[PDB]
Every structure is written in C-alpha cells, then in structure tokens.
Design a binder for these strands. Structure first.
Lengths: 41, 75, 185, 52, 105
RNA sequence: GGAGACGACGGCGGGGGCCCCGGGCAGAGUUCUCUUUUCUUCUUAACGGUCUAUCACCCUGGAAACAGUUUGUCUGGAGAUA
C-alpha cells in the first residue's frame, strides 16, 4: 500500500486516540498539544 | 400518489364527488391489506394490516363506487 | 401536582422550579402496609447527565418527600403513564432537552425526541396504545414510543396552545388556546 | 472399451471453444431412441408402456 | 438443533425398474461429505428409504438441496440415464425423477 | 438587490451506482476419475410525504502554562477552545 495512504491512516488513529484520552481525562490540554505535534513528526 | 393513515379520512375521500375508481389489494405474504381510491388528481391508499377492520371498511364505503378486489395477473 | 395512577401506591409528584419532587403524603389512608409498598416501589431503582436523581435533605426527608430529580431548566407540565413506571416533564425553553421521560424503576432520565419543531408546552400519554403526544405552540405531534418515530401531526388553528387533553377512548382531543378557542380534534 | 466409447461420445458433443447450447429440457427426443437405449440397459420396454 | 428434511422421489423410474433405489442409497452413503471428507456420516445426516420408491434425507447440519440435486445428477450419468431422466423440484424440499418429453416417431 | 451568471487544477471526505467476495432458492453444464463444483435469475422510474448536514450564522463566556486542528495547510480579543 502506498506510503501516502499509510501515513494518512496512521495519523487518524493517532489523533482519534489523543482526542479520546483528552476527553476521558487521562491527559491534560498541555500534554495533548505536545503529543499531537510529536505525532505529526 | 399519497398515503392515508386513518380510516375516516379514507371514507371522506371516497365520498368526494370525483371519486372514480376503488380497489382492494390483498398482500398475504406481508399480511397486509390496501384500500386504494382514485379521485382525479391523486391516488390515495390506506394500509390497514388487519382483516377485521378491512371487512368493516368494505361495508362502510358508499355503494355507488363498485369496489373490486385486485385479481392476480392483470391483463 | 400529579398523582401516580395506581391505587396501590399513593405517591404524589410535585413540580417546584427545575427539580421534581416525589412524596408520600401523610394521609388518613396510608396503611403501614401501603407505606412499605410505596417505599419499596419508589426506592427500587437505587441500584452533564440529564435528570440527576438524588435524595432530598434531612428536613425534606422528615417532612415526607422522598426523591428529587433535577433537570436543566424549569418545567411546566407533568404527565404520568398508566402503569406508573414512566412519567414525563415538559420544560419550555429547555431546547432539545425540553421533553424528558423518566423511568422510576431504573432511576433513568432520557430525552427520546431531540429535534422538536417548536416550543414545547404540554405532553401526555395515550390512554390505550403505547404512543406519546407532545404539544408545541401551534402543533400537537404524536410519536410512537416503540419505534421512536413521529406518526401524526395535529394542526389546530391556535396562535398559542394553552392545554390539551385526550379522550379515554384515545381517538379524540380537546385543545385549549390563549386566543379563546376550544377545538375538538 | 466402454470407457473409450463413452469418452469418444463426449468429444462428439464437446467443442474446442465454449458455445451456447440447447438444454435437454428444451429439445425433443424421438420415441425410438428411448426404447433403443433402455433395451441396451436390459429393461422391459413393453412393461413400462413406453408408448405413453 | 434445527432439522432439515429432503425427499428424493423416484417412484415412476422405480416402477419402470430402470432406477435402483437400493443402489442410490448406497451411492449417497459413500458420496455425501460432512466436514470436507466422505465417510464422515455420523448422526448429522441420515438416509432412509420409504416404500414408494422414495429416499428421505434428514440433516442437522447446513446441507443444501442443491448438493442433493448434484449427487442424483452424478448417479444418473453413472447409470447412463442423464440423457433421459431429469430432476425437478415440485415442492419445498422434494425432488422428483421423471422422463423428458418424448415425441412419437 | 438576488438568481439567471460562469476559469483551470490538486489531494481528502460523504452518498449512489458498476466491479469483487460469501450464503440461500430455482434452472442449466462437466462427470473414466476428481470437483458440498461452474454458469445464469434474484429488478424497482417520474412524482409526493417524512427524516437526515459540512460550511455559514446566533447566545453565554473570556483565552499565554497559548490553544483548537488538517493527509496537507492554517484559525483566534475584528472574540478561539468549550
């Protein structure tokens, strides 16, 4: 499968999990922003 | 074509001056009964899903409209 | 104020502000056998959520009231079901949480119909078949409770519907209006 | 020998490339062919009143 | 725990004595496969004969009647009756052996 | 004053069709041997009612320990997240 499609699917499930953790209260706002940009790397 | 969801609305349509055709449709596999009346602009159908209410409705329609059952395999 | 329709309970529901109070009145006819059955039914379900159920205060417990259900906005009408396990409260200016149905045996408050066309005024239960009537300012929408779907819309000519009541036969309505008109449907 | 005769008769109906063929329910078969074939099978053809 | 019943009716070919019902029962016991293999005929599938030239198959597994139509079609070719005997379905699970249409010459 | 009334492209998302895969009903085909096997049917228009929304817009509120957020870009005291 092309790397474009894989990067894309990896980014959605990483961003979906970060939203779920931030909504459930397991992380704070400031840790969520750092983890979002570490995922973007 | 429109749908009528109440019995006494259907009789009021059948008592209109332009009510021309009236048909009764048996669907035994789905166990439902359909009363359809034609009054020029639109075809109104009533889905009853009961044998007892269909027999009372058949006797309550005006005798001027010759109500007919739909025969299987239309020519 | 509305009574539980079952003759075996003698429970009163009162609408004061946002929160809904359920009490057991100290009446001459409250036999301790009837009181224990009244206690048991109303306490059977203790085993931003809408409808936070809670125990009232120590002052209110001694006075006679026993439960308290608080909602987001002030309510104006209470309707009971025939069996007595369901009751609904209409809260005007509650927006999508205007009509909330509460289950007494489960201590559960739900909003069945979110999108409501108009400002809700009064709701009622059907006397025979399972379905729900909700009356806005200019319409009375009939919902079937089993499939959670609208099956009928009743349109009186009222500018503002004040109240409505359903016949015990369940096929007729009387609609009251602030513009002086009584309408039979 | 009977295996080869059956295999040769299969090649008589078969074609090199697939063609659309008439089903046996559609074609009509003669009276004399049924009494002939059942006689090879050793069946009394007069007992079954094969003359319908 | 569901039971499915199929009936193969060979009454007219058996009365003509051109179809051996006992040979068809032995054929069905050697060719019906249950778990991908033949000879695995346990309590899941049972084959019996009814005295009118009929074979009754009762299945507790997911046995298709199309499979039973495929096995009787195979038996007719082995008996050289494929050109003259046809399998039709006349009821919900009843398959009947009958002749093709014959024209007088 | 609006509609009529409007450039080219790109990656992404939704929805319907077509293709692909599995089961079942019915018919057809191979069958020396093998193949619970291969193929075909399994459809639903205009119109009418009802339900369904990204953007956009409104109310509260006031944001730096900056935050929201896309595959990418970006957005916010000219009012963001919620």
């Amino acid at each position: 499968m092309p790397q474009q499609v894989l990067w894309m699917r990896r980014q959605r499930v990483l961003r979906r999990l970060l939203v779920k953790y931030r909504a459930s209260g397991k992380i704070d706002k400031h840790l969520y922003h750092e983890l979002y940009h570490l995922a973007k790397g | 074509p429109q749908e009528v969801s109440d019995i006494k609305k259907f009789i009021e349509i059948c008592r209109r001056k332009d009510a021309s055709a009236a048909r009764i449709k048996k669907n035994p596999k789905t166990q439902q009964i359909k009363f359809k009346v034609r009054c020029q602009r639109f075809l109104y159908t009533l889905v009853l899903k009961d044998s007892d209410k269909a027999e009372k409705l058949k006797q309550s329609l005006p005798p001027n409209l010759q109500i007919k059952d739909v025969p299987k395999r239309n020519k | 104020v509305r009574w539980r329709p079952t003759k075996d309970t003698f429970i009163l529901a009162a609408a004061a502000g946002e929160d809904i109070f359920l009490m057991i009145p100290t009446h001459p006819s409250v036999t301790p056998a009837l009181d224990q059955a009244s206690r048991d039914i109303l306490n059977a379900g203790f085993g931003e959520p809408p409808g936070k159920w809670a125990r009232p205060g120590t002052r209110l417990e001694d006075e006679g009231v026993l439960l308290r259900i608080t909602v987001r906005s002030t309510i104006k009408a209470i309707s009971w079901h025939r069996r007595g396990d369901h009751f609904a409260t209409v809260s005007p200016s509650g927006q999508r949480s205007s009509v909330a149905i509460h289950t007494l045996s489960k201590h559960l408050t739900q909003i069945p119909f979110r999108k409501l066309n108009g400002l809700a005024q009064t709701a009622s239960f059907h006397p025979l078949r399972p379905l729900f009537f909700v009356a806005t300012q200019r319409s009375i929408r009939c919902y079937d409770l089993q499939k959670l779907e609208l099956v009928k819309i009743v349109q009186p000519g009222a500018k503002w519907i004040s109240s409505f009541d359903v016949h015990p036969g369940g096929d007729n309505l009387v609609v009251g209006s602030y513009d002086k008109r009584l309408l039979w449907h | 020998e009977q295996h080869a005769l059956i295999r040769n008769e299969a090649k008589m109906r078969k074609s090199l490339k697939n063609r659309a063929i008439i089903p046996r329910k559609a074609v009509k078969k003669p009276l004399s062919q049924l009494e002939d074939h059942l006689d090879q099978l050793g069946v009394d053809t007069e007992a079954i009143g094969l003359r319908a | 725990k569901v039971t499915k019943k199929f009936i193969i009716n060979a009454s007219q070919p058996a009365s003509d004595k051109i179809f051996d019902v006992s040979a068809f029962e032995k054929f069905l016991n050697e060719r019906i496969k249950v778990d991908g293999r033949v000879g695995n005929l346990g309590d899941v599938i049972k084959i019996s004969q009814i005295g009118d030239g009929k074979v009754e198959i009762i299945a507790h597994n997911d046995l298709s009647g199309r499979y039973l139509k495929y096995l009787t079609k195979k038996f007719l070719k082995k008996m050289q009756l494929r050109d003259w005997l046809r399998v039709v379905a006349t009821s919900k699970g009843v398959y009947e052996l009958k002749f093709y249409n014959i024209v007088n010459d």
